């Protein structure tokens, strides 16, 4: 009388890597491009 094994509930897909600061950096460059393009006119 030993509770038999149980099937692994399932998989809950969840993926997180290095986006935060990589895209914040990406942004800081576009802003400066915009400023320069504005300045030229």
């Amino acid at each position: 009388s030993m509770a038999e094994d149980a099937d692994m509930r399932n998989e809950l897909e969840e993926m997180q890597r290095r986006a935060d600061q990589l895209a914040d950096e990406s942004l800081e460059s576009t802003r400066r491009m915009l400023q320069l393009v504005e300045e030229s006119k």
Binding site: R17, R18, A19, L22, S29, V37
Partner: peptide, 27 residues
Amino acid sequence: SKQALSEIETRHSEIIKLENSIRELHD
């Protein structure tokens, strides 16, 4: 995912070159 973020960095790679070109035109 690792591949997705590698691709995002690859996409960002061109932003610096474009910024340099625009600053060149501004100068």
